[PDB]
Subunit: 230 residues, 2 copies
């Protein structure tokens, strides 16, 4: 019997692109006004900085919020601001980015289904990103929410899955992870010993030899799918 069901956030519970596009635009406009010494910055330029940081410390890849604040800092300093005002503007502009990326549209299928599942399963979140369920309508459905930045390591590494299993106190064979990414969610959870349900609403083809343990196109299929393994 399945005791634990964990879920990926971006493109599993909502479409990721729109809220991140809006967040970028918001970050952009706030800098144009509040840091007018930085000026129109090509995507190319933040990346140059980002890549230097990742070369100096590759583990930054698992700390996406810290990484972005640091990139913003270096860009600001390098455009003329005092170390102190740069840090302070970096901090403020990031908080504007982060408020923006939380303006997501949760799929309609999500709340009704989480409510059903919570009657019978312990539920958790495992995300590489910086969407925080407490900021959304969702904190109360989940026993816990894990993110790579707090762990210092992200999916598909075993660590985040093992930590979920620890917090629930269940063995891998009693757990299912649900997500949209073939490598991060599916292969990741399976290599940690769990079952994995692939969320594929657009009906994409699967191309790895090990199959998802199930595939769905709508989250409200979860209760029937999980009952298979009861």
């Amino acid at each position: 019997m399945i005791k634990l069901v964990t879920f990926d956030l971006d493109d599993t519970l909502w479409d990721t692109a729109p809220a991140i596009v809006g967040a970028e635009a918001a970050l952009r406009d706030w800098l144009a006004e509040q840091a007018p010494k930085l000026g129109p910055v090509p995507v190319e330029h933040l990346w140059e900085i980002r890549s230097r940081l990742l070369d100096e410390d590759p583990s930054f890849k698992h700390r996406i919020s810290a990484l972005r604040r640091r990139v913003l800092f270096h860009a600001l300093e390098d455009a003329g601001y005092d170390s102190d005002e740069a840090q302070q503007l970096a901090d403020e502009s990031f908080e504007v980015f982060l408020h923006g990326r939380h303006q997501v549209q949760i799929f309609p299928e999500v709340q009704p289904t989480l409510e059903i599942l919570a009657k019978t399963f312990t539920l958790g979140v495992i995300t590489n990103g910086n969407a925080d369920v407490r900021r959304l309508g969702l904190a109360d459905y989940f026993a816990f929410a894990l993110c790579a930045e707090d762990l210092g390591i992200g999916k598909p590494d075993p660590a985040p899955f093992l930590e979920a299993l620890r917090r629930a106190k269940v063995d891998a064979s009693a757990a299912v992870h649900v997500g949209d990414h073939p490598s991060d969610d599916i292969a990741g959870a399976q290599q940690a010993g769990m079952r994995a349900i692939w969320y594929n609403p657009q009906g994409k083809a699967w191309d790895a030899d090990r199959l998802p343990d199930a595939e769905i196109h709508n989250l409200s299929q979860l209760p029937e799918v999980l009952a298979r393994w009861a």
Copy 2:
């Protein structure tokens, strides 16, 4: 005595930022027109694909045009388009980017100075980017123009500098490189045995032990600086 002067392009012969920003926007606009299925894509989403390609083939960093075309390809195809239409769209959208990329405003100090220098020195270009002087009114001042994409290796590696010396048929002690970047241009050229002149119009501070052989804020200072080493 000085026979060869080589010059970096971006941020030494013109401001880097504006033409590239315009290019990104033109690229953005043309794709909303001819590739409606891709839709508004977060900068973050291109970085992931870019990062993926740089993983399978790290030498992609020296092929910036080819790299962008491949990233455009994968985003279009992974947006639904067939391998055929993706590739034609990638290729076409890239040419639009590249055209916009060449709408630079050459510093007024440049042409008058190149004309003077050309009378007594061999002039060359050494760049990691995809600005092509042949597409600009500047082509006639230069004997050669090396880019990292054609050499498969970029500054600060000594290879592009050593190639320049071979094209001009002179020894390193007979050569000077002019550039804005402390590592790519200055340290790079000096480690290859050349003299290096730091283009620093904004009056930034220099913080490496080894000094640029000279520092200027206006390209028209070159004739007098070069005369020091005659």
